[PDB]
Design a protein around this ligand. Structure first.
Ligand SMILES: N[C@@H](Cc1c[nH]c2ccccc12)C(=O)O
Ligand SMILES: [Mg+2]
Ligand SMILES: [Mg+2]
Ligand SMILES: [Mg+2]
Ligand SMILES: [Mg+2]
Ligand SMILES: [Mg+2]
Ligand SMILES: [Mg+2]
Ligand SMILES: [Mg+2]
Ligand SMILES: [Mg+2]
Ligand SMILES: [Mg+2]
Ligand SMILES: [Mg+2]
Ligand SMILES: [Mg+2]
Ligand SMILES: [Mg+2]
Ligand SMILES: [Mg+2]
Ligand SMILES: [Mg+2]
Ligand SMILES: [Mg+2]
Ligand SMILES: [Mg+2]
Ligand SMILES: [Mg+2]
Ligand SMILES: [Mg+2]
Ligand SMILES: [Mg+2]
Ligand SMILES: [Mg+2]
Ligand SMILES: [Mg+2]
Ligand SMILES: [Mg+2]
Ligand SMILES: [Mg+2]
Ligand SMILES: [Mg+2]
Ligand SMILES: [Mg+2]
Ligand SMILES: [Mg+2]
Ligand SMILES: [Mg+2]
Ligand SMILES: [Mg+2]
Ligand SMILES: [Mg+2]
Ligand SMILES: [Mg+2]
Ligand SMILES: [Mg+2]
Ligand SMILES: [Mg+2]
Ligand SMILES: [Mg+2]
Ligand SMILES: [Mg+2]
Ligand SMILES: [Mg+2]
Ligand SMILES: [Mg+2]
Ligand SMILES: [Mg+2]
Ligand SMILES: [Mg+2]
Ligand SMILES: [Mg+2]
Ligand SMILES: [Mg+2]
Ligand SMILES: [Mg+2]
Ligand SMILES: [Mg+2]
Ligand SMILES: [Mg+2]
Ligand SMILES: [Mg+2]
Ligand SMILES: [Mg+2]
Ligand SMILES: [Mg+2]
Ligand SMILES: [Mg+2]
Ligand SMILES: [Mg+2]
Ligand SMILES: [Mg+2]
Ligand SMILES: [Mg+2]
Ligand SMILES: [Mg+2]
Ligand SMILES: [Mg+2]
Ligand SMILES: [Mg+2]
Lengths: 16, 46, 271
RNA sequence: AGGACCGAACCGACUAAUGUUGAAAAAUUAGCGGAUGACUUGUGGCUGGGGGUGAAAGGCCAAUCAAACCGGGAGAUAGCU
RNA sequence: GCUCGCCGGAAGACCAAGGGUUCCUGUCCAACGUUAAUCGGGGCAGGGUGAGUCGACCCCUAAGGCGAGGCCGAAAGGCGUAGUCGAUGGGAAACAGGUUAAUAUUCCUGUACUUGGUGUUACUGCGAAGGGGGGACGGAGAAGGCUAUGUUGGCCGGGCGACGGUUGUCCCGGUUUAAGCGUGUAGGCUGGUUUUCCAGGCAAAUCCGGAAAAUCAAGGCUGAGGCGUGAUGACGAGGCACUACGGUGCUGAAGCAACAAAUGCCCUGCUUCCAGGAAAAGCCUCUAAGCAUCAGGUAACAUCAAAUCGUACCCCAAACCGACACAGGUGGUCAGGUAGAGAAUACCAAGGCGCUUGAGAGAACUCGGGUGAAGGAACUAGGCAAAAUGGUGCCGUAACUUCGGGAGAAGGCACGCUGAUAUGUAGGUGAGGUCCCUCGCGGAUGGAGCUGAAAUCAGUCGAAGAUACCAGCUGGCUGCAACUGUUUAUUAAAAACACAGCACUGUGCAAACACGAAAGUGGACGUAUACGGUGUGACGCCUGCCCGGUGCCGGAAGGUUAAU
RNA sequence: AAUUCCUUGUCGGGUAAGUUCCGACCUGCACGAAUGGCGUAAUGAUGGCCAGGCUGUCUCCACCCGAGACUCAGUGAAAUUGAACUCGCUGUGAAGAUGCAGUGUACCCGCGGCAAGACGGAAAGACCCCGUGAACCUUUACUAUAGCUUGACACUGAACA
RNA sequence: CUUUAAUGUUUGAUGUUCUAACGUUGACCCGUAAUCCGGGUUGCGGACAGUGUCUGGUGGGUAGUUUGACUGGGGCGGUC
RNA sequence: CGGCACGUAGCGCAGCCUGGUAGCGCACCGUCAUGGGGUGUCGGGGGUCGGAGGUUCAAAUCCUCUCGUGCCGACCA
């Protein structure tokens, strides 16, 4: 499946 | 934690068993396909 | 006797019970019971088809004679009972031929009084009679609509009907709704107002009181997203729609009566 | 008497640290809420996919949900990589 | 094997669900076991599940399912009557002990019981897919009576102490016993019996129901437990043997009383309250058609039948759901001692375990804990986290308040141990002896024996007596939401949702409304004091102006206007 | 003010000092009466502010007891990876260099430590635009349509006015 | 071989009356120990109601879609 | 700042669109009442049209240069 950090929004969204 | 499969044979047979399968035009087509496929367990019963 | 409760806890603070001391404490007349079994507001398709219905206490069904055929024979009212299936109270009856039945319970009730049905029968609270034979102006409760059919008007606590006129083979009645409906005159109609009346005044007082009468919560239109219901989304309250039922027809004034088969009978609609 | 009080079982999941190739695809430890009620629980039943159910979050409908899963139309179409 | 340590409302014990040979015994160690492995829930082989009484099957039905005909639907199919299925509920009956390596309320010993068939012997109106009765039912609360169970004494057996003392007011251990049968108690419910009559109980009824009288009132159900019996039986501390050192045989004392005591039982009771608390059969009774010497019905004794299927083992887990011998999830049952209010908590018993890598080192750092000079929130987004508070009795307690609350507000004081009051008191329990008597498990009086708090006075030890474990921090101002509650299973528990209360609006019942090509079903076996929809959200004081727009309600005129 | 942009408005209070807080003013950018106004005892794992107690939260960290980290023995993973003989600096350069130029420095190889760089690993960037992309949602967008509703003809007749 | 008007008709509009299609989720009867259906009798309603075809209205309840390009990012503006 | 709308007698809008006149409300001022005022009957006056002139016979207008003022936007991250 996918690692938790990839699914998680705060770490992943990082630069909008 | 409580997971999705909570086994119970009564429910098993009532929901997926031979007779249940047999009680509906489509349930019968279920068997028909499995027979044509040459399946060794038509419906996992006693 | 209506009675406030002392605030020994919130959700008692506001309660107001109706205590009827003269109501039979103890079990009901066994052989006039059949199981009722709850509906959960659900169809024979399993589909919720009237919302907000579920749970509540168990409730055994009291039979109740609405038709009132035992003409001639008189009866005596043994006792007054509480009925879970209705607002009104019922009186266990006992006709002289040894037979017991369940009547409603007009304002007078009171154990030991004497009831009778039929074209003869005293004009007096509790006696049933074709309105053919009740004096115009009486206050007649549980009323038949088709002669011999059953009795379907004014059966709720404190309700009543007023016979105002009777030309031809017909009577015109004044329903509590304020409507003016004609009815076949040959129709039975028990005499007087129906009891409790005070029923109106209870206050329930807390959430549970509702739940355990089998009423489930009502969730507002505009508390839901667009897909669920024509109301709201909005990023903050918002409305901007003529109000409608969850299927789109307007509430707030749209009549929705369409019959014709039975318009002949309505003389004047309520307001 | 009580959707009454303090508090175990039982039901919850407010804070923190740990854990994050875990002991664990959602838990551990210390604290925390409810605890005769709109409580909680075993068994069995009914509701089906633009449909269900929803004390309403687009929540849940088998670790899947702004339209479940399986097979089919099927080599959908892809002026894009 | 001897120590040591850990759980003990479990980490002990019995199951259901689920698994499906994991059970027991031999044998093997490659693979499986997070290491080794002589060991295993692993390989191979053999063994092991014994029932009239437990359970299924079975009779009975709830939800709900299926459904001859039937109604409906382009086909497929949908709904539903008669029925017929469906337990999570009702329905006859066995207990104490022993034994297997492995099952046992199933095998064995002792002692029982249930229902039918048949026979004998008495005595008799029997008889339904039918009537009535019963089965049959909620929540909370209150004690009384009682058992499990415990403690002490007595009794029995054994002990005379590795170190000063222990022939005693000393130590250790045991002191267990069923169904069944008899008795019918504490206590619960209920007036009995006869005669006649009757529009009810679809027919019938002697039953139930109703109405009269008539006569005695004590009759009848229900009923924990105790007591007797069961039982000279069993079990039994402990003994002696032998053992292939795992065990296996044999023998066998006392086996009483007092006090305490459940959440169990009496109790499906009793009291009270509103939210008003399954069904059907088995059972009892009633008769109809029908049978009247018969058959059937009742009883005693005798006898025969009770098939079939399950029964090993795990079952808060290494055997089930979690891909794992996974810190998770999993319903029911039992529940000892010391302290304690307690199923909290700490230490123990019975019993069960030390968690399937270990051995050394005594660095940084990380995790989890303990203590800290002086300072005491200076930290920080924020006292995050830690620290502190923590029991019982008495004294005492502000604004405000819907008069309940706020409140455990706040804050004080006492607290151990010894002696006395009182060689053990207030109280609890209660045997003798005497009287009463419808003689009983009765009652009255009776006070041995047993049990035994709290107070005060006096004294006394520590730094400290609610000494461990366990066990509120408190107060002031203010926003929001009345309140208990609900929610994004897995980053949001909130001011969001709900709520009682309020209002508008629809709905006259073949209701509006919803599911549905339809039949039909829900709404409701309800009927406007009802039901749906919508908004608002306890309570208090209140809710002003605008109908031009959009919508809705009303409007028999006229203008424009569809098929035809 | 859960509404105030200007705004740390202004005045009063609390502090040695207060963009928050409590009380006011009214100049309400842009409150207001059941998409309720103003109050409110009680309740709240609710938001903001204050104080006593308390303390390793801090000044500023010390020591200690346990589990890892380290050593030996047994068993034995992982992501990543064009190929590697895989230094510093200044500069060049698809514009932020271990690898190019110039130059400085550096004997070969572990073990324990630490994370500044390998524009480290992980996921064909949500965010931004683009495609004559998708989906759900909205409405007085367009075209249709179930539903509701209107009339005509049929089922459907007789009288008398 | 008539407008100022009226007796026999074939024919619309309205209003009364009737029963006989049609409705009846009134009552009773039988199939039948049966709250289904059917048949029957009867009361009520009655050429209405309802339904079929056609038809005007309403119709985000539901569905399929459209909603331009240029652009010193895109949007807004402007432009074509 | 930029977008786009408008300042018009003392003051606020029409007229602009579709070139012209510049109106109207109340106020100002005078008469007339009344003792006087206020009010009012009643008479006259009051706008470089916000500044400006190119088009043209004719510009407040349309267009262009331009000033503050009001209103809409300085947003997605
Ligand atoms: N357990 C994860 C949280 C998590 C689980 N699944 C996720 C999926 C997406 C994001 C986070 C998670 C943690 O270490 O915090
Ligand atoms: Mg409501
Ligand atoms: Mg809301
Ligand atoms: Mg929402
Ligand atoms: Mg939002
Ligand atoms: Mg949202
Ligand atoms: Mg808004
Ligand atoms: Mg409570
Ligand atoms: Mg509590
Ligand atoms: Mg899921
Ligand atoms: Mg393709
Ligand atoms: Mg194709
Ligand atoms: Mg095996
Ligand atoms: Mg074994
Ligand atoms: Mg090995
Ligand atoms: Mg084995
Ligand atoms: Mg059955
Ligand atoms: Mg058929
Ligand atoms: Mg069916
Ligand atoms: Mg069962
Ligand atoms: Mg065993
Ligand atoms: Mg015999
Ligand atoms: Mg019966
Ligand atoms: Mg005892
Ligand atoms: Mg000695
Ligand atoms: Mg002893
Ligand atoms: Mg067993
Ligand atoms: Mg293991
Ligand atoms: Mg496990
Ligand atoms: Mg414990
Ligand atoms: Mg281990
Ligand atoms: Mg070690
Ligand atoms: Mg210190
Ligand atoms: Mg401070
Ligand atoms: Mg600082
Ligand atoms: Mg600070
Ligand atoms: Mg804290
Ligand atoms: Mg602490
Ligand atoms: Mg709340
Ligand atoms: Mg969450
Ligand atoms: Mg949360
Ligand atoms: Mg209403
Ligand atoms: Mg609200
Ligand atoms: Mg404020
Ligand atoms: Mg609104
Ligand atoms: Mg709450
Ligand atoms: Mg190693
Ligand atoms: Mg470099
Ligand atoms: Mg290194
Ligand atoms: Mg690191
Ligand atoms: Mg991409
Ligand atoms: Mg659409
Ligand atoms: Mg398309
Ligand atoms: Mg473009």
């Amino acid at each position: 499946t996918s690692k938790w950090f990839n699914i998680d929004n705060k770490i992943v969204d990082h630069r909008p | 934690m409580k997971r999705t499969f909570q086994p119970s044979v009564l429910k098993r047979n009532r929901s997926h068993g031979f007779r249940a399968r047999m009680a509906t035009k489509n349930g019968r087509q279920v068997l028909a396909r499995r027979r044509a496929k040459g399946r060794a367990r038509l419906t996992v019963s006693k | 006797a209506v009675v406030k409760c002392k605030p020994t806890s919130p959700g008692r603070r506001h309660v107001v019970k109706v205590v009827n001391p003269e109501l039979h404490k103890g079990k009901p007349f066994a052989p006039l019971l059949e199981k009722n079994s709850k509906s959960g507001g659900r169809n024979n398709n399993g589909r919720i088809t009237t919302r907000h219905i579920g749970g509540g206490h168990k409730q055994a069904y009291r039979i109740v004679d609405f038709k009132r055929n035992k003409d001639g024979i008189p009866a005596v009212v043994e006792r007054l009972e509480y009925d879970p299936n209705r607002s009104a109270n019922i009186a266990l009856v006992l006709y002289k031929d040894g037979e017991r039945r369940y009547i409603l319970a007009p304002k007078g009730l009171k154990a030991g009084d004497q009831i009778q049905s039929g074209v003869d029968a005293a004009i007096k609270p509790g006696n049933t009679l074709p309105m053919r034979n009740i004096p115009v102006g009486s206050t007649v409760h549980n009323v038949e609509m088709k002669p011999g059919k059953g009795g379907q008007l004014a059966r709720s606590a404190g309700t009543y009907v007023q016979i105002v006129a009777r030309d031809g083979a017909y009577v015109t009645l004044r329903l509590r709704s304020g409507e003016m409906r004609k009815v076949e005159a040959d129709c039975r109609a028990t005499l007087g107002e129906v009891g409790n009346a005070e029923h109106m005044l209870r206050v329930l007082g807390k959430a549970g009181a509702a739940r355990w009468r089998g009423v489930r919560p009502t969730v507002r239109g505009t508390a839901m997203n667009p897909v669920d219901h024509p109301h709201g989304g909005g990023e903050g309250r918002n409305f901007g729609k003529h109000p409608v039922t969850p299927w789109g027809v307007q509430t707030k004034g749209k009549k929705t009566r369409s019959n014709k088969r039975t318009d002949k009978f309505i003389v004047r609609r309520r307001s």
